[PDB]
Amino acid sequence: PKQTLDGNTAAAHVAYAMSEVATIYPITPSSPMAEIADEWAAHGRKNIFGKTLQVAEMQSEAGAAGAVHGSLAAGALTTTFTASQGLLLMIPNMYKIAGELLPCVFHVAARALSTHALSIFGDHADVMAARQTGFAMLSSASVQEVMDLALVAHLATLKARVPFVHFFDGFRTSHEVQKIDVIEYEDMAKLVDWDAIRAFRQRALNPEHPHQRGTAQNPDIYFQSREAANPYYLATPGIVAQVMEQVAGLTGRHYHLFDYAGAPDAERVIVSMGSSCEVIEETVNYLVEKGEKVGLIKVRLFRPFSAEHFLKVLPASVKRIAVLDRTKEPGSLGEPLYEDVQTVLAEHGKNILVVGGRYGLGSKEFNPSMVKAVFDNLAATTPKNKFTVGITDDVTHTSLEIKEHIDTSPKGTFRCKFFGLGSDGTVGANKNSIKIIGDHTDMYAQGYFVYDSKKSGGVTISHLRFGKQPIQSAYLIDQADLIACHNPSYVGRYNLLEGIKPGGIFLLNSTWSAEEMDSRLPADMKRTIATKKLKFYNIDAVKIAQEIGLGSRINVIMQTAFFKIANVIPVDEAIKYIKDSIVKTYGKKGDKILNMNFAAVDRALEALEEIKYPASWADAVDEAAATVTEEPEFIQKVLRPINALKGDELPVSTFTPDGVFPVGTTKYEKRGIAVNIPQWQPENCIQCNQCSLVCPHAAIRPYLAKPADLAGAPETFVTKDAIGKEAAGLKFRIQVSPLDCTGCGNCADVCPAKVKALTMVPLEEVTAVEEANYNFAEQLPEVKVNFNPATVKGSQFRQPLLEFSGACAGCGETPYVKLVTQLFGDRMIIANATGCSSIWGGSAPACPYTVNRQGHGPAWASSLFEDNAEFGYGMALAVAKRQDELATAISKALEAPVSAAFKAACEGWLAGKDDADRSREYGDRIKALLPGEISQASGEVKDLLLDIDRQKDYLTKKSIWIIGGDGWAYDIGYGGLDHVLASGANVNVLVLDTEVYSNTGGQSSKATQTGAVARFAAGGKFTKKKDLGLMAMSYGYVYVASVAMGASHSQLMKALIEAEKYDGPSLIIAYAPCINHGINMTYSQREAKKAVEAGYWPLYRYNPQLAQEGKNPFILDYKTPTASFRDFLMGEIRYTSLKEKAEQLFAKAEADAKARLEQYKKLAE
Amino acid sequence: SSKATQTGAVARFAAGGKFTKKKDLGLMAMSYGYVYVASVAMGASHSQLMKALIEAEKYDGPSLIIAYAPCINHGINMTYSQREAKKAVEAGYWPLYRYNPQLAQEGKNPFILDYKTPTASFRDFLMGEIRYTSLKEKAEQLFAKAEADAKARLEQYKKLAE
Ligand SMILES: CC(=O)c1sc(CCOP(=O)(O)OP(=O)(O)O)c(C)[n+]1Cc1cnc(C)nc1N
Ligand code: SF4
Ligand code: SF4
Ligand code: SF4
Ligand code: SF4
Ligand SMILES: [Mg+2]
């Protein structure tokens, strides 16, 4: 049958049928494969063995690989899904699985490796790093090929005993939705070699016929024993060929080890692998029809590389070959596939000029215009070798010139682009539209979706194609027949109408009438609309959703408008499929919600109005651009073009060679995505600064100013007298940043005043006013205040050094980290684990960490997911070494002819170099005397002072902070975190516990509580939450504290300050509410208060320093809970979706909270 | 050196002796509550080892057995290898306990301390193995911390048994 799937689902479909066990661990973009396999097991889908697949989630990809090996050695057919850094951790086990000849299939959504920077996007870097493990490697070029070749891999591995890596391009294929022929499980089982499966069972470890495997061998037999597996590899190519013939007879689709396409007398041939083959074949068809003698060799079975099967498909007329590799091996003579082609042709004396290139690293676009550029390079007198395609390399001059733009799309293919907002329903609707057309027409359908790094309010661009011929266009849409914009704010911001065909369709969602079109649309846009004679349609979907009662959901409304004008299918048939899909989507909803979505379809059809524009629009002239502000070179040359969706145009000379970026760049974004912003009521405000404390984006802060500094203030900058003996004679004001606020509503909820001093007002009504207010507050001079930073009110007067990140609205993680920068940000270094905290904390080109007026701020670095603790541990050793080098140079200065005041500060620094305040005090004393002391010296004395001046950046003691998520701390990095805590080094570990893998969509973890439902835990987690804090207490010298900002502000302040001052390891586990819980982010702070008050989350502090003072180290900060336990669980969707078996799990959760509280009461006694 | 190496023991990668104390693997495994944990030493009690092995296999769940294994790297006469394990337990150097999760389901305390009162001298045991005598100024400072930590660990296991 025909279904619309993506590469991930197509792979999991085959993997589920052929496997008994599947040990998995989540990593983008391979995690959808394991997610859908777990759901099928939860609903009881049977494999070819009549059982449900057993899915086991491990602590890391290393643990998964070991489990695969053990499951295979004990007699169970097992598979797994991984990619990129996860595949690297499996490489050691892959050598064993290949060495022991165990049948196995790894499904890999090939993704770039983290080098100078992280990239979750697709290339072959990960697969190439395992090409020497002895695994076979099979490449799929399309979603249909993922379906077919996954079956080829699972069938061949049983026959050959050689394990297979079946890999496909990350995102470009794993997330591309296509209508494909799906193979039925019953048809697969008729092709399985059951004799081979039974033979695999006999090789299993069993006490009734025991054997020994994995021995240790001396030099006398090791070489021979390694060569004893040679026959199995020699026969593997022929086995895959015969298996490919089996699939061919079943499906009719013919695969070979290497496939050829193009002119039979071709002289220029490209050899490639993966999704690029689709783009190349599409281009080859276009060029061959135009008479060019070109061809393409698709590599399916990369390892073992069969010279016989490659030369069999190489036409004898080939004179020049260009090999394209989707990876980069720096310093290597060539990339892997290029070296193989060059080798095999040399071994057979073929006089063929071979040239290699690189393309598509990290999902770089690779379109037919580039393919012709590769072909044109073969036609030059001297073809450029070791080239790149898709970039402008103006440094090393390896890039090929994209001369002209060609359109190789087959005639009759429809092409659409959809500009949407984050989570507004656009992407989901397009997925539904593809399923509609694919299920009800003979047309092939394709969908690809471009997402943003910003988690909320980001831009999404959908690329859809439909045609009567198979869709090989594995690239973004170049010439669109229809363009839809679901957010009027994009009008004038992005080049929406780029490349639209003459006479195409432009669909806009806006409240603007035909007359307002003259004043609202920019001149360049009006010129394109008129010159290209576009059919311009408009619809006020927001007005419709308000009148119907759907709120602001416009997904159904805009989808109806699309089918009405696209003319892809009969309009009447489209309306039926939409309403039929509405029943499938809103059938479980109430009867009132069902008829509302029906009214959306009906009202949308009558509200869609075509805009008849005057022909004079073609002559419209742009308005005079304002005087541009002098921005930094990085902002002007890098950040602006990237945010303008033009980053692909930046040449190589734009970037640093080591992936280093400046700090404090998010303050230049000013996205202004909030629907509502807080308005401050000066008369109700008690000056508590809690609103600045809980803001997940630092968009609201208190400002102090002497009355003289308020001279040129606007009339709306209303202030009040400052409360407190420290701020006597000063003015006070709580000011919000309108363009940086997210509209989450946490600050309005936390305001404890009698009358609410913060009320959510719409942005557009107060945007002009609040902009001038914030611009004035930012230009206020620094104000020296003596408020105690240990209090909540006093701490918020310090400048936040973490601002305007890409975290979601109301995120529960960023308020913790923001507070740390306000206390110790002047002198801290951050080692941040991979995860959400690294995504909003370090996504190029914007950096949310900033500096104060002196230019000092946190230095931020992220290594890998599993090594974050040891990453920061190494930093501590180096910083200690850098302070040791300085202390040696200062001690030599004591014996030098220097000022007596200089010696006093130097001796004072040496005595207190390990104290934060004393080192800053005497360190700043040394800094003040340095410029004059150098001027008064000469000769060797000047050189001794110049060496101290070179190291003055290490006078102030540093504070190492290791920040990471619960998935890092509880699972993959726990072994490393355990080691760093036991060492006793002066490090501070901050665990942002969201109880899930938040970034990758919310998968199960050891931090997940009993009964909680998340991805990889469809039926709920049975085992209880692992107590990380209890294990760290077993050392006795590790400071452990459990905090929750929403529950107690004072308890969080005490634990953080005690943890930082403790000369030893400190562990802070903070509860961070997240959108993956399924709650209203408006009450994120309130949800943390209910969690502690109901006994769900404990608050304690384990102070080893109290043990040295003869006191009890364990202090329970909240002993008696007052709220109901079951009532807190029912307030979050992550527990209500389980409801049945839920009542059995809820009882275990309540009993564990009483036993955990009773366990803490015994330790406190 | 390992995390299992005790305080003051001299081994490769620990020329000056290991400062941090031995990681308590059994204590962390008991935090789950459903993991069977037992600490045994054959030279000390033949009957105690028999009970832990049979209880561990029959337990329908995870079991962790930490067994003291004398080694030539300790620097002892291997003729008294069994005797060295007896002297280790009798001096409070190695604990003998059994944490049975099945006892928790029966309303009883899961932790059973199999050796409550040590009878041998703790400092005297260290001088009988080469891996501790090779440190010999600062060595006497490390032995006092090791002996104080061993007494605090025994008082902790007596509190867990109640
Ligand atoms: C970014 C990326 O590739 C992420 S973020 C993440 C889990 C984050 O969950 P955590 O609880 O630790 O933090 P949180 O997001 O704040 O909830 C994974 C598994 N990955 C994939 C992954 C897998 N394995 C390895 C070695 N590296 C990475 N980056
Ligand atoms: S509404 Fe949310 S983002 Fe806006 S200022 Fe308040 S807390 Fe910050
Ligand atoms: S939370 Fe309310 S009372 Fe407190 S500073 Fe903010 S606006 Fe004023
Ligand atoms: S932790 Fe949750 S709320 Fe915060 S940015 Fe990540 S997904 Fe969004
Ligand atoms: S005594 Fe010998 S065999 Fe036994 S653990 Fe020590 S080195 Fe290994
Ligand atoms: Mg998390």
mmCIF file of C-alpha atoms in Angstrom, chain A residues 463-703:
data_model
loop_
_atom_site.group_PDB
_atom_site.id
_atom_site.type_symbol
_atom_site.label_atom_id
_atom_site.label_comp_id
_atom_site.label_asym_id
_atom_site.label_seq_id
_atom_site.Cartn_x
_atom_site.Cartn_y
_atom_site.Cartn_z
ATOM 1 C CA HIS A 463 8.647 22.863 1.186
ATOM 2 C CA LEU A 464 5.984 20.707 -0.490
ATOM 3 C CA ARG A 465 5.973 19.060 -3.919
ATOM 4 C CA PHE A 466 3.370 17.038 -5.830
ATOM 5 C CA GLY A 467 3.656 15.479 -9.273
ATOM 6 C CA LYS A 468 2.705 12.663 -11.610
ATOM 7 C CA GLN A 469 6.348 11.521 -11.744
ATOM 8 C CA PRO A 470 8.522 10.322 -8.841
ATOM 9 C CA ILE A 471 9.915 13.252 -6.840
ATOM 10 C CA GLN A 472 13.724 13.153 -6.843
ATOM 11 C CA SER A 473 14.107 16.811 -5.775
ATOM 12 C CA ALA A 474 15.955 16.277 -2.496
ATOM 13 C CA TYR A 475 16.636 20.002 -2.147
ATOM 14 C CA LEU A 476 14.825 23.153 -1.091
ATOM 15 C CA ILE A 477 12.281 24.636 -3.465
ATOM 16 C CA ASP A 478 13.850 26.966 -6.014
ATOM 17 C CA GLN A 479 10.892 28.079 -8.177
ATOM 18 C CA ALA A 480 7.563 27.923 -6.317
ATOM 19 C CA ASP A 481 4.125 27.828 -7.932
ATOM 20 C CA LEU A 482 2.520 28.958 -4.655
ATOM 21 C CA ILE A 483 3.850 30.830 -1.613
ATOM 22 C CA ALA A 484 1.871 31.156 1.630
ATOM 23 C CA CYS A 485 2.732 33.431 4.562
ATOM 24 C CA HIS A 486 0.932 32.539 7.802
ATOM 25 C CA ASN A 487 2.401 35.452 9.782
ATOM 26 C CA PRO A 488 1.962 39.041 8.542
ATOM 27 C CA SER A 489 5.004 40.122 10.580
ATOM 28 C CA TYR A 490 7.199 38.338 8.021
ATOM 29 C CA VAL A 491 5.944 40.785 5.378
ATOM 30 C CA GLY A 492 8.859 43.146 4.787
ATOM 31 C CA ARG A 493 11.202 41.045 6.960
ATOM 32 C CA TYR A 494 12.092 38.019 4.799
ATOM 33 C CA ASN A 495 12.282 37.623 1.017
ATOM 34 C CA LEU A 496 9.024 35.678 0.815
ATOM 35 C CA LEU A 497 8.353 35.915 -2.947
ATOM 36 C CA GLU A 498 11.871 34.781 -3.917
ATOM 37 C CA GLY A 499 11.963 32.693 -7.077
ATOM 38 C CA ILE A 500 8.181 32.528 -7.434
ATOM 39 C CA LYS A 501 7.060 31.558 -10.926
ATOM 40 C CA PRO A 502 5.336 34.118 -13.181
ATOM 41 C CA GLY A 503 1.601 33.904 -12.607
ATOM 42 C CA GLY A 504 2.088 32.079 -9.311
ATOM 43 C CA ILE A 505 -0.045 32.338 -6.191
ATOM 44 C CA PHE A 506 0.719 34.403 -3.079
ATOM 45 C CA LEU A 507 -1.465 33.670 -0.037
ATOM 46 C CA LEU A 508 -1.285 36.050 2.927
ATOM 47 C CA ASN A 509 -2.856 35.993 6.385
ATOM 48 C CA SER A 510 -3.533 39.568 7.448
ATOM 49 C CA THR A 511 -6.224 41.991 8.574
ATOM 50 C CA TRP A 512 -5.351 44.445 5.793
ATOM 51 C CA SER A 513 -7.889 45.439 3.142
ATOM 52 C CA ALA A 514 -7.168 45.958 -0.555
ATOM 53 C CA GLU A 515 -6.740 49.701 -0.006
ATOM 54 C CA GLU A 516 -4.313 49.236 2.904
ATOM 55 C CA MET A 517 -2.204 47.057 0.546
ATOM 56 C CA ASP A 518 -0.787 50.232 -1.018
ATOM 57 C CA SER A 519 0.597 51.446 2.326
ATOM 58 C CA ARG A 520 1.416 48.123 4.041
ATOM 59 C CA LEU A 521 3.263 46.168 1.412
ATOM 60 C CA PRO A 522 6.822 47.280 0.571
ATOM 61 C CA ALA A 523 7.561 48.623 -2.886
ATOM 62 C CA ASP A 524 9.874 45.775 -3.915
ATOM 63 C CA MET A 525 7.154 43.282 -2.976
ATOM 64 C CA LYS A 526 4.499 45.237 -4.884
ATOM 65 C CA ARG A 527 6.818 45.390 -7.900
ATOM 66 C CA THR A 528 7.237 41.608 -7.901
ATOM 67 C CA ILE A 529 3.482 41.047 -7.493
ATOM 68 C CA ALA A 530 2.648 43.273 -10.466
ATOM 69 C CA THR A 531 5.487 42.438 -12.867
ATOM 70 C CA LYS A 532 5.054 38.681 -12.370
ATOM 71 C CA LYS A 533 1.238 39.067 -12.495
ATOM 72 C CA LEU A 534 0.704 37.032 -9.331
ATOM 73 C CA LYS A 535 -2.731 36.009 -8.068
ATOM 74 C CA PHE A 536 -2.737 37.682 -4.641
ATOM 75 C CA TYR A 537 -5.206 36.273 -2.090
ATOM 76 C CA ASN A 538 -5.729 37.421 1.500
ATOM 77 C CA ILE A 539 -7.568 36.056 4.532
ATOM 78 C CA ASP A 540 -8.074 37.307 8.094
ATOM 79 C CA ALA A 541 -7.726 33.945 9.803
ATOM 80 C CA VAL A 542 -7.275 35.545 13.234
ATOM 81 C CA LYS A 543 -10.617 37.358 12.949
ATOM 82 C CA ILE A 544 -12.305 34.099 11.939
ATOM 83 C CA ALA A 545 -10.816 32.103 14.825
ATOM 84 C CA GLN A 546 -11.882 34.799 17.303
ATOM 85 C CA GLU A 547 -15.474 34.871 16.047
ATOM 86 C CA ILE A 548 -15.779 31.070 15.990
ATOM 87 C CA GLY A 549 -14.188 30.644 19.412
ATOM 88 C CA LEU A 550 -11.021 28.819 18.336
ATOM 89 C CA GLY A 551 -8.892 31.548 19.914
ATOM 90 C CA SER A 552 -5.904 32.207 17.655
ATOM 91 C CA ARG A 553 -5.462 28.717 16.148
ATOM 92 C CA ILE A 554 -5.334 29.272 12.379
ATOM 93 C CA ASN A 555 -3.979 25.906 11.201
ATOM 94 C CA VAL A 556 -7.329 24.586 9.951
ATOM 95 C CA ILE A 557 -8.265 27.980 8.491
ATOM 96 C CA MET A 558 -5.108 28.418 6.437
ATOM 97 C CA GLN A 559 -5.139 24.795 5.257
ATOM 98 C CA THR A 560 -8.627 25.314 3.830
ATOM 99 C CA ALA A 561 -7.476 28.477 2.053
ATOM 100 C CA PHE A 562 -4.606 26.544 0.454
ATOM 101 C CA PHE A 563 -6.710 23.834 -1.202
ATOM 102 C CA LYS A 564 -9.209 26.451 -2.377
ATOM 103 C CA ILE A 565 -6.632 28.173 -4.601
ATOM 104 C CA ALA A 566 -3.896 25.595 -5.279
ATOM 105 C CA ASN A 567 -6.001 23.621 -7.807
ATOM 106 C CA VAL A 568 -4.109 20.445 -6.946
ATOM 107 C CA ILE A 569 -7.330 18.437 -6.512
ATOM 108 C CA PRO A 570 -11.034 19.280 -7.016
ATOM 109 C CA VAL A 571 -12.057 21.867 -4.429
ATOM 110 C CA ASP A 572 -15.120 19.844 -3.412
ATOM 111 C CA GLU A 573 -13.064 16.704 -2.764
ATOM 112 C CA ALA A 574 -10.586 18.708 -0.675
ATOM 113 C CA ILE A 575 -13.291 20.064 1.638
ATOM 114 C CA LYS A 576 -14.487 16.518 2.369
ATOM 115 C CA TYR A 577 -11.007 15.232 3.232
ATOM 116 C CA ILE A 578 -10.413 18.179 5.561
ATOM 117 C CA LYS A 579 -13.630 17.656 7.518
ATOM 118 C CA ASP A 580 -12.991 13.904 7.537
ATOM 119 C CA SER A 581 -9.529 14.564 8.975
ATOM 120 C CA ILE A 582 -11.087 16.965 11.496
ATOM 121 C CA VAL A 583 -13.117 14.070 12.910
ATOM 122 C CA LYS A 584 -9.912 12.035 13.163
ATOM 123 C CA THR A 585 -8.117 14.924 14.902
ATOM 124 C CA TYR A 586 -10.895 16.445 17.034
ATOM 125 C CA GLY A 587 -12.956 13.289 17.533
ATOM 126 C CA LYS A 588 -11.741 12.774 21.077
ATOM 127 C CA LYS A 589 -12.479 16.444 21.769
ATOM 128 C CA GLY A 590 -15.890 17.695 22.831
ATOM 129 C CA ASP A 591 -18.836 18.107 20.498
ATOM 130 C CA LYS A 592 -18.541 21.887 20.821
ATOM 131 C CA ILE A 593 -14.890 21.812 19.700
ATOM 132 C CA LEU A 594 -15.785 19.623 16.713
ATOM 133 C CA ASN A 595 -18.335 22.035 15.231
ATOM 134 C CA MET A 596 -15.983 24.977 15.792
ATOM 135 C CA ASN A 597 -13.373 23.466 13.475
ATOM 136 C CA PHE A 598 -16.130 22.683 10.973
ATOM 137 C CA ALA A 599 -17.144 26.347 11.064
ATOM 138 C CA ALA A 600 -13.509 27.284 10.434
ATOM 139 C CA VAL A 601 -13.599 25.466 7.088
ATOM 140 C CA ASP A 602 -16.958 26.981 6.100
ATOM 141 C CA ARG A 603 -16.154 30.565 7.123
ATOM 142 C CA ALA A 604 -12.688 30.390 5.554
ATOM 143 C CA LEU A 605 -13.969 29.599 2.050
ATOM 144 C CA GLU A 606 -16.238 32.650 1.992
ATOM 145 C CA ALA A 607 -13.657 34.931 3.623
ATOM 146 C CA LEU A 608 -10.806 34.278 1.176
ATOM 147 C CA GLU A 609 -10.673 37.411 -1.012
ATOM 148 C CA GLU A 610 -8.509 37.933 -4.102
ATOM 149 C CA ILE A 611 -6.703 41.289 -4.147
ATOM 150 C CA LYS A 612 -7.004 43.053 -7.518
ATOM 151 C CA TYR A 613 -3.988 45.388 -7.516
ATOM 152 C CA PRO A 614 -3.431 48.276 -9.948
ATOM 153 C CA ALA A 615 -0.896 47.737 -12.710
ATOM 154 C CA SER A 616 0.903 50.849 -11.389
ATOM 155 C CA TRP A 617 2.299 48.711 -8.546
ATOM 156 C CA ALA A 618 5.133 47.612 -10.855
ATOM 157 C CA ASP A 619 6.532 51.169 -10.798
ATOM 158 C CA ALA A 620 6.402 51.660 -7.005
ATOM 159 C CA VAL A 621 9.562 53.134 -5.484
ATOM 160 C CA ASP A 622 11.195 52.182 -2.196
ATOM 161 C CA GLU A 623 10.983 54.644 0.669
ATOM 162 C CA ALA A 624 14.103 56.482 1.805
ATOM 163 C CA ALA A 625 16.016 54.274 4.231
ATOM 164 C CA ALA A 626 16.771 55.772 7.632
ATOM 165 C CA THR A 627 20.298 56.581 8.793
ATOM 166 C CA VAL A 628 21.644 53.163 9.800
ATOM 167 C CA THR A 629 23.187 52.964 13.263
ATOM 168 C CA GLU A 630 26.888 52.192 13.628
ATOM 169 C CA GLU A 631 26.837 48.555 14.758
ATOM 170 C CA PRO A 632 29.855 46.352 15.548
ATOM 171 C CA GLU A 633 31.507 44.577 12.634
ATOM 172 C CA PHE A 634 30.372 41.158 13.885
ATOM 173 C CA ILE A 635 26.757 42.300 14.228
ATOM 174 C CA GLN A 636 26.901 44.120 10.884
ATOM 175 C CA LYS A 637 28.687 41.416 8.867
ATOM 176 C CA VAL A 638 27.598 38.163 10.579
ATOM 177 C CA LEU A 639 24.550 38.268 12.865
ATOM 178 C CA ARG A 640 22.292 40.416 10.671
ATOM 179 C CA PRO A 641 22.736 38.360 7.453
ATOM 180 C CA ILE A 642 22.248 35.088 9.367
ATOM 181 C CA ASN A 643 19.024 36.304 10.985
ATOM 182 C CA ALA A 644 17.949 37.646 7.568
ATOM 183 C CA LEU A 645 18.092 34.023 6.294
ATOM 184 C CA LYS A 646 21.160 34.783 4.150
ATOM 185 C CA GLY A 647 23.861 32.862 6.035
ATOM 186 C CA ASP A 648 24.592 30.636 3.036
ATOM 187 C CA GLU A 649 25.991 33.701 1.233
ATOM 188 C CA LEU A 650 28.706 34.356 3.851
ATOM 189 C CA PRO A 651 32.132 33.287 2.508
ATOM 190 C CA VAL A 652 34.768 31.327 4.425
ATOM 191 C CA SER A 653 36.718 34.498 5.291
ATOM 192 C CA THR A 654 33.797 35.507 7.515
ATOM 193 C CA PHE A 655 34.448 33.004 10.298
ATOM 194 C CA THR A 656 37.154 32.313 12.851
ATOM 195 C CA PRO A 657 39.172 29.133 12.198
ATOM 196 C CA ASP A 658 38.381 27.713 15.659
ATOM 197 C CA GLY A 659 34.672 28.420 16.152
ATOM 198 C CA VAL A 660 35.139 31.174 18.759
ATOM 199 C CA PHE A 661 32.346 33.748 19.043
ATOM 200 C CA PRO A 662 31.974 37.052 20.930
ATOM 201 C CA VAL A 663 29.766 37.433 23.989
ATOM 202 C CA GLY A 664 26.747 39.641 24.620
ATOM 203 C CA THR A 665 25.191 39.486 21.155
ATOM 204 C CA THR A 666 21.584 38.551 21.998
ATOM 205 C CA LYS A 667 20.943 42.150 23.091
ATOM 206 C CA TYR A 668 21.029 43.026 19.362
ATOM 207 C CA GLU A 669 18.176 40.638 18.465
ATOM 208 C CA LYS A 670 15.094 42.432 19.866
ATOM 209 C CA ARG A 671 12.736 39.900 18.316
ATOM 210 C CA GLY A 672 9.569 41.375 19.849
ATOM 211 C CA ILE A 673 7.516 38.181 19.736
ATOM 212 C CA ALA A 674 5.426 38.717 22.878
ATOM 213 C CA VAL A 675 1.652 38.984 22.714
ATOM 214 C CA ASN A 676 1.436 40.631 26.156
ATOM 215 C CA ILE A 677 3.994 42.568 28.217
ATOM 216 C CA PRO A 678 3.904 43.470 31.944
ATOM 217 C CA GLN A 679 2.857 47.025 32.796
ATOM 218 C CA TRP A 680 4.224 48.232 36.131
ATOM 219 C CA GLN A 681 1.936 49.895 38.692
ATOM 220 C CA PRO A 682 4.289 52.064 40.801
ATOM 221 C CA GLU A 683 1.830 52.494 43.683
ATOM 222 C CA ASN A 684 1.332 48.750 44.313
ATOM 223 C CA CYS A 685 5.032 47.850 44.131
ATOM 224 C CA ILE A 686 6.827 46.906 47.366
ATOM 225 C CA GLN A 687 10.274 46.930 45.692
ATOM 226 C CA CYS A 688 10.968 43.227 46.139
ATOM 227 C CA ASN A 689 12.631 42.541 42.744
ATOM 228 C CA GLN A 690 11.145 39.032 42.574
ATOM 229 C CA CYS A 691 9.879 39.767 39.053
ATOM 230 C CA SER A 692 13.444 40.305 37.861
ATOM 231 C CA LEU A 693 14.363 37.083 39.681
ATOM 232 C CA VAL A 694 11.881 34.775 37.920
ATOM 233 C CA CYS A 695 12.103 36.175 34.376
ATOM 234 C CA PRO A 696 13.385 33.399 32.062
ATOM 235 C CA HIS A 697 14.731 36.049 29.645
ATOM 236 C CA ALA A 698 15.937 38.903 31.911
ATOM 237 C CA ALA A 699 13.454 41.204 30.197
ATOM 238 C CA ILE A 700 12.339 42.863 33.461
ATOM 239 C CA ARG A 701 14.823 44.449 35.869
ATOM 240 C CA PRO A 702 14.893 47.128 38.580
ATOM 241 C CA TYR A 703 16.658 50.419 37.887
#
